[model samples]
Target: GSSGSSGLETSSYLNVLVNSQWKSRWCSVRDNHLHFYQDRNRSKVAQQPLSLVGCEVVPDPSPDHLYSFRILHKGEELAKLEAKSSEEMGHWLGLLLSESGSGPSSG
Candidate 1:
């Protein structure tokens, strides 16, 4: 399940990964809407996301701010993941860009 602001239309199409290999292809949050991709066989895909508040890059010589978030399952706390550095963001962005096969070109 996603946060209230996630704007997930309904749970009917949502799939949860309970065990092994996260039976889902990929899950992403776009425009604040949680969208799940279905497998080739039209089977429901299950994946989970870590709850880390969005980060903002501050001015140079300033310390980065780290926010706390709770990862819940069935309203129960499962794990805690922090989103402080850009590494995680880069990883996710890479996954998204990989699908397109074309990304920003460096000069």
Candidate 2:
């Protein structure tokens, strides 16, 4: 829905767990913030600014059938996401890392 010269507008569908159920959300980054919607053309359901000051992204420790990762904020688990595949996981992970200033920036 938005664009930026800083190159943080990548979009992907992520499997997120909410209320003990898994739901797929259309997620994107804009202006250093992460936003998610029910679908690609729908309004945002939630958003969070990207920051390493009180946030962390780590590999999901729970055993699961899919490749997973955890988003931690203030030392607390925020969300647990599962990638459809390893390739997809790499792509998302790379983007997240870049937004957090922990990896090289890309266009």
Candidate 3:
């Protein structure tokens, strides 16, 4: 398994649907791209993607030139994590993983 950065890029976005939620992130800088992270806190049985599968810039509900982020996998809806000001959306993203049983929970 490629334990580090996969080195994948795209001008549009990546969509990943695990359970049934939507999460959206960004990929501008090469370092900002998504990679694979191992959830070692548990027992080395889980691995998480560096970035959400489908992350695209959507119309932000606010009127201050913002964009509501969303992620999709194979056309299935996942988790809507949150709105990002910077080029990374990690808060809600972590939440989405936890909800989808992909977090650091010791099961």
Candidate 4:
């Protein structure tokens, strides 16, 4: 009941790469879209909500930075986010993107 959980609308405080600058912000996944908030309360809004439906989730390039990941869309980056621990990173990955069984199973 402390760190986080899996499934829909996974959210928490994380560091995001914006304008080549690192800024801590609250992030969440809703309706296959990513919403960025200035605070955990979600009172302050940040940038536009990024739709993750057609996007890809990538891990940090450099191995030096642990608990890090990224979001890619049409050869572009939406955000680079880092969690508090490796476990948190894993949970986020599951929430962000996963095999939805839309191949040879569901049309």
State the lDDT of candidate 3 residue by residue for 7-35, as single tens digits: 43332232323364443333222233343
**Regarding TM-score, does 3 or 4 come out ahead?**
4
lDDT per residue as tens, model 2, 1-107: 22333533467677877788878767766655566677446565666534533356676635665467777775787667777767667666666755555334333
Clashes of each: 1, 0, 14, 0
If scored against the real structure, what TM-score would every candidate get?
0.24, 0.68, 0.24, 0.75
lDDT of candidate 1 at residue 18, scale 0 to 100: 41
Off by over 4 Å in 2: 1-9, 42-54, 102-107
Ranking by lDDT: 4, 2, 3, 1
The Cα error of candidate 1 at residue 8, in Å, is: 22
Which of the two candidates, 1 or 4, achieves a greater TM-score against the reference?
Answer: 4
Worst 10 residues of 1 by lDDT: 53-62
Error of 4 at 82 (Å): 0.9
Q: Name the lDDT of candidate 4.
A: 0.73
Whole-model lDDT, candidate 2? Answer: 0.63
* Per-residue lDDT over 40-102 for candidate 1, one digit per residue giving the tens place of the 0 to 100 score: 433563344332222222212114333322233344544322233444433343333333222
Clashing pairs in 4: none
TM-score for candidate 2, please give it.
0.68
Indicate the TM-score of model 3.
0.24
> Per-candidate RMSD vs. true structure?
15.2, 7.1, 14.0, 4.1
